[PDB]
């Protein structure tokens, strides 16, 4: 199938309490492999997955230096944006950046990304063409202009279409036994009477990968999506994910309910019934 590499940067200012906290994490699909944290003792880009550990010292010194150059850029960017929105010097603000590339089953480049946010909302984003930008407001318009005069997009595109996919393919090869796999979900149902007239039916999905999944409750074949409660997919901590969907059914009608699970792993959509 297709694969992706994605990095996430978060810079949180903290006036008076020192320089802003910078955190970066790298991912290949749904598996993290590196991380940098300014509030950590190492002050180095560190490994978060066994397979990235085969990279020599020069790799780590490079990532550290280049990711530190990034904290430097974000540190001052935090200041100018504060200006753009005429915000006080004592407030805490955050800049988030996400960027990466997707490749298909043959390792070919499909698309690249680069999107930035300020205080939890979109600020500016590189368009699919990797040649133009989309500013969310008048402030980002100031940045859009500066970024055009500097031909910033060209630099981004060169990376997204070059080293981004080159290294994405490399990681997929170096950690093939762990990255190129799909763990189908293990499923079971639970039952909780809410009263003598109602009961909760919860459908579970455990130890699956990738994280993307679909859980649905049907009654007599009829889709019940609206009375169904779903929790956010969550990580088990071992590289697999979990998730459940629940539904409140009249005491005595549970036999009519069916849970359907859809995942890239399982050859065919599963179907669970109470009893």
């Amino acid at each position: 199938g297709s694969h992706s590499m994605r990095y996430f940067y978060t810079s949180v200012s903290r006036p008076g309490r020192g320089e802003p906290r910078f955190i970066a994490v790298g991912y290949v699909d749904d598996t993290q492999f590196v991380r940098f944290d300014s509030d950590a003792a190492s002050q180095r880009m560190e490994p978060r997955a066994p397979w990235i550990e085969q990279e020599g010292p020069e790799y780590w010194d490079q990532e550290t230096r280049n990711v530190k150059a990034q904290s430097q850029t974000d540190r001052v960017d935090l200041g100018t944006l504060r200006g753009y929105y005429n915000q006080s010097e004592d407030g805490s603000h955050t800049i988030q950046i996400m960027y990466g590339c997707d490749v298909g089953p043959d390792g070919r480049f499909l698309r690249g990304y680069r999107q930035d946010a300020y205080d939890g909302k979109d600020y500016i984003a590189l368009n699919e063409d990797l040649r133009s930008w989309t500013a969310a407001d008048m402030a980002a318009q100031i940045t859009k202009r500066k970024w055009e005069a500097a031909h910033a997009a060209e630099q981004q595109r060169a990376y997204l279409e070059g080293r981004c996919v080159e290294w994405l393919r490399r990681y997929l090869e170096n950690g093939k036994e762990t990255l190129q796999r799909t763990d189908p979900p293990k499923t079971h149902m639970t039952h909780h009477p809410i009263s003598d007239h109602e009961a909760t039916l919860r459908c579970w999905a455990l130890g699956f990968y990738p994280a993307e999944i679909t859980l649905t409750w049907q009654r007599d074949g009829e889709d019940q999506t609206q009375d169904t409660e779903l929790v956010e997919t969550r990580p088990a901590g071992d590289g697999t994910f979990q998730k459940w969907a629940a539904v409140v059914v009249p005491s005595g009608e549970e036999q009519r309910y069916t849970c359907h699970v859809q995942h890239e792993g399982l050859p065919k959509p599963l179907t669970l019934r109470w009893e």
Partner: peptide, 10 residues
């Protein structure tokens, strides 16, 4: 691998 250099200042 992250970019060799950060993006132009905002």
């Amino acid at each position: 691998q992250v970019p060799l250099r950060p993006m132009t200042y905002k």
